[PDB]
């Protein structure tokens, strides 16, 4: 009955991918000073099957301190967008997460730092030519820096898997893409302050100001949808593919800190950021990390370097200090199919105000 | 009866499979030569007529001396990719396949590899991997009185890939030779004076007038399939594969005006897999700053990807893991080739922000087409 | 064609197993020791489900107790922390038996990039070498102590999705044996002028370098909750009865400008070949070689190429070059099988041959038990 439903969906998906034509087009641009406004509600266009949004973000920042500079934080330009929230034409919320978490998922799905330029020995002048994602390492006292950042906000899982896409052929009922940008308070961290959400940190932080930020949203969708008597993958279009994040506190030295997957959700990936009191360490404050089921079954209890080794196989490098990734794409964590599962971190040292920022990528049935 | 087609397709696929399973791949040298570009620079190579030919790997080396008393020269953006100026291939029936510039062929080699062709990636590995063998290499500058050594490789494709033989050539034994023509760089194309257009040059600088090749040398390796499988009906072969042309060609168009859409029409018949547009802004090559946007559209005013230069570059970063050189723009249509007939006329669009004198768009295309 | 049945069946059982079992990676052993006391260890894997391989983590602290002279990493560096590996399955059949450097080069070939490396990019976001997964200081100055980390994957199964070579460790009696021979104070340090092939550091202070200590941790990767069907467990019988092994050998007798041929044996389906030209302790970037090739019985070469062009094919495989004097050959799609087409040999025609020259060969292959 469902075995048949599954097959029909996949076939409709296949026909839709074969007959419709992919389009990516600008839906809105705005230039502004976050000192004036930092939250914008973009109204996507209602056209065919929407797969996602590519959001271009640029900014000019000035360090007016008399003598001190500021330097990029570990997340840097990824913190230009503080949060993103999307609602479909039914006002059903899909993704709702931080710019840094969205960016880390973009990297994970690309298999390499998102839209980066790889360095090679080629004498031909390939390289960072176009500065697609870019930000100066430091901004000296009295200097102005230019930054460029891109985020892909997904609806559909991928280019070929339309699970999570949105049918937006629904006139009168619009979608909504909420972008909440960085501002002078969030973007600059004083020495000693927590740099988690900031773009720059340093002794010149107090006198740093955005001169402006601008964004351009491009909506990617499928046009010329195939018609029989309309071919649509009904499971695909009624599943939500979402990203979300949360914070957890309560870490104690040498004790297993467990974060339950309160599932029914099919978790494709998990990111755990160990914000150790504003301190971000390269695994030295952790004994091990693991994923486990009640049955004390640790399917992957690993020391930090070996955990990182698994990630190097996924994105060809390490995520920034204190950021840990876990891929469960092929076999998504689904609790009422494996029984309560949890993500575990056993800290070796815990600073005051220590916490785990959890980011999840998952599928779930709509309505 | 459009079944005849889907029938022929299935048989072509079937045979391609059998041919790939049964035959055995060989790569062998067909010719090597060292010469002085002052004496000659155009060569016609006669490949061996054996089995099904997939392509040619062309190794080129050169020694260049900057004889200037005081000034240096530095690599242009294309650099060693300009060691071969033009490449043209003719099959045993004398039908032309690829006919393009060395730089265009190279950018396509890169596009198809998914990274700068034959480059050595840099990593944190303590083990001594790296640029050990200098496969594609050229000194960044050649000082006054110094001699630099360069190495460049080009893959001239007949077959689309190692597993897709569309475009491959049966070097039967028509007693009709194939021909691979190579027009190399020479002392008049390789060196650009300051202020001169660097497009086709290898080095540019104040010492350019006194630069010369000591020698250029090339080696052509032919890649083919041997031991072709025979059945009852005789030799089993994907006749659609073998009767299709997979070619690269380039062209030039002028007439750009600031803020006006400059449209290059795609021709009919051809199924365009990729498009490269080089904005030679009168000898100036800029990192997108002289362009408003680029697009692909249908006369039906429908742009399927009208994008600002940075967002266009972002798409390319997804394909080759980096940016192509300044002023070089890439467009991948591999999954759904541009085909005017299944879509109506289509054109590649560039709306320039600034246009210098003698501005032009150099177009490079990868496409499939029927022998008839 | 009654074999198409068996194969068709094997492939189906493979998919069911992959689809139904759940992957586990777990520590089976950890140990710290002083190479001065012992350097050979026999690890005993857990006998659970289908075993795919072992991830071996190795850390070491090396002290250069020399008065004034430093030492610098050799081309292989930390890849020589493990000198050799040998694996015996529950039926006492050996699988891999090779050098640590050969195993490491195969790990790289299979990943398609230097194994567990961190690629450098222009990203402003701080990705990079954050965790030093495989790491070793370029030099250890007189009086200093350096910390190294190395990882090796010992394969049983060919890949995550191809279980050819995997081991059913339900077979209880007879434990499996994972034997590891580590570097020690005699193999890790080469004096200037000495052959650096097996060493980790080479230099004027080598004679006074020593291991402060070495430590290792073996993680076993396997499939659990095997699917049970009508007539019992659903298993890919062809996969589980095929051996996927890496092995090394050495050959000498090279003469300038003469083809040196190393014959491939029959029965084995060789997936890859690695040839290291240890030219009397000197390792050159192709300049001591005229060409390399793979040749058939009587016919000619199917790959006679100059060293740079040979290196070009490798660049398409691992996105970079292997260290000096190390040559790779991928035959994964059409394995070399002498039964398929007469004896085949690997050929190296050397340009210059030093005293004590030799080719150190490394092979990856499939064979039935």
Curated annotation (Swiss-Prot), chain A:
Signal peptide: none
Subcellular location field: Virion
InterPro entries attached to this UniProt entry: Phage_PRD1_P3, Phage_PRD1_P3_N, Viral_coat, VP_dsDNA_II
One Pfam family, short name: Phage_Capsid_P3
Key words of the record: Capsid protein, Virion
Main localization (coarse): virion
Keyword Transmembrane helix: no
Gene Ontology cellular component list: viral capsid
Subunit structure: Homotrimer.
Function: Major capsid protein self-assembles to form an icosahedral capsid with a pseudo T=25 symmetry, about 66 nm in diameter, and consisting of 240 capsid proteins trimers. The capsid encapsulates an inner membrane and the genomic dsDNA genome. The major coat protein P3 and two assembly factors (P10 and P17) are needed during the assembly of the virus particle inside the host cell, when the capsid protein multimers are capable of enclosing the host-derived membrane, containing the virus-encoded membrane-associated proteins.
Name this polypeptide is given: Major capsid protein P3
Organism of this sequence: Enterobacteria phage PRD1 (Bacteriophage PRD1)
From Swiss-Prot, chain B:
GO CC entries: viral capsid
Chief place where the protein resides: virion
Subcellular localization(s) per the UniProt record: Virion
Intrachain disulfide bonds: none
InterPro entries noted in UniProt: Phage_PRD1_P3 (IPR015108), Phage_PRD1_P3_N (IPR016115), Viral_coat (IPR029053), VP_dsDNA_II (IPR016112)
Pfam families on file: Phage_Capsid_P3
UniProt keyword list: Capsid protein, Virion
Quaternary structure annotation from Swiss-Prot or TrEMBL: Homotrimer.
Role noted for this protein: Major capsid protein self-assembles to form an icosahedral capsid with a pseudo T=25 symmetry, about 66 nm in diameter, and consisting of 240 capsid proteins trimers. The capsid encapsulates an inner membrane and the genomic dsDNA genome. The major coat protein P3 and two assembly factors (P10 and P17) are needed during the assembly of the virus particle inside the host cell, when the capsid protein multimers are capable of enclosing the host-derived membrane, containing the virus-encoded membrane-associated proteins.
Protein name: Major capsid protein P3
Organism classification: Viruses, Varidnaviria, Bamfordvirae, Preplasmiviricota, Tectiliviricetes
Swiss-Prot record, chain C:
Entry superkingdom: Viruses
InterPro entries: Phage_PRD1_P3, Phage_PRD1_P3_N, Viral_coat, VP_dsDNA_II
Subcellular location, record wording: Virion
Coiled-coil regions listed in the entry: none
Entry keywords, A to Z: Capsid protein, Virion
Pfam (any one): Phage_Capsid_P3
Any one cellular-component term (Gene Ontology): viral capsid
Chief localisation class: virion
Quaternary context: Homotrimer.
Function per UniProt: Major capsid protein self-assembles to form an icosahedral capsid with a pseudo T=25 symmetry, about 66 nm in diameter, and consisting of 240 capsid proteins trimers. The capsid encapsulates an inner membrane and the genomic dsDNA genome. The major coat protein P3 and two assembly factors (P10 and P17) are needed during the assembly of the virus particle inside the host cell, when the capsid protein multimers are capable of enclosing the host-derived membrane, containing the virus-encoded membrane-associated proteins.
Protein name: Major capsid protein P3
Organism per entry: Enterobacteria phage PRD1
């Amino acid at each position: 009955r469902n075995q048949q439903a599954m097959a029909a969906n996949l076939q409709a998906r296949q026909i839709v991918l074969q007959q419709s034509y992919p389009v990516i087009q600008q839906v809105e641009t705005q230039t502004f000073d976050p000192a004036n406004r930092s939250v914008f509600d973009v109204t996507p266009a209602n056209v065919g099957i929407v797969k996602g949004f590519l959001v271009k973000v640029t900014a000019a920042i000035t360090n007016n301190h008399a003598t001190e500079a500021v330097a990029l934080t570990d997340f840097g330009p990824a913190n230009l967008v503080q949060r993103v929230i999307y609602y479909d034409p039914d006002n059903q919320r899909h993704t709702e997460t931080s710019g840094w978490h969205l960016h880390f998922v973009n990297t994970a799905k690309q298999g390499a730092p998102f839209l980066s330029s790889m360095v090679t020995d080629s004498p031909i002048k390939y390289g960072d030519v176009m500065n697609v994602i870019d930000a100066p390492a430091t901004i000296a006292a009295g200097a102005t820096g230019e930054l460029t950042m891109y985020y892909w906000v997904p609806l559909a899982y991928s280019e070929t898997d339309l699970t999570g896409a949105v049918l937006a052929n629904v006139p009168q009922s619009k979608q909504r893409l909420k972008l909440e940008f960085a501002n002078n308070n969030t973007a600059f961290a004083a020495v000693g302050a927590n740099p988690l959400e900031a773009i720059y940190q340093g002794a010149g932080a107090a006198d740093c100001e955005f001169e402006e930020i601008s964004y351009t949203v491009y909506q990617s969708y499928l046009d010329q949808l195939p018609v029989g008597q309309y071919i649509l993958p009904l499971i695909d279009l009624s599943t939500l593919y979402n990203l979300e994040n949360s914070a957890q506190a309560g870490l104690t030295p040498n004790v297993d800190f467990v974060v339950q997957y309160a599932n029914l959700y099919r978790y494709l990936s998990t990111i755990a950021v160990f914000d150790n009191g504003g301190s971000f360490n390269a695994g030295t404050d952790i004994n091990y990390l693991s994923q486990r089921t009640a049955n004390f079954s640790d399917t992957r209890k690993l020391d930090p370097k070996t955990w990182a080794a698994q990630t190097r196989r996924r994105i060809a490098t390490d995520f920034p200090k204190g950021v840990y990734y876990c891929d469960n794409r092929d076999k998504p964590i689904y609790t009422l199919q494996y029984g309560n599962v949890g993500f575990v971190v056993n800290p070796k040292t815990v600073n005051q105000n220590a916490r785990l920022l959890m980011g999840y990528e998952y599928f779930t049935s709509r309505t």
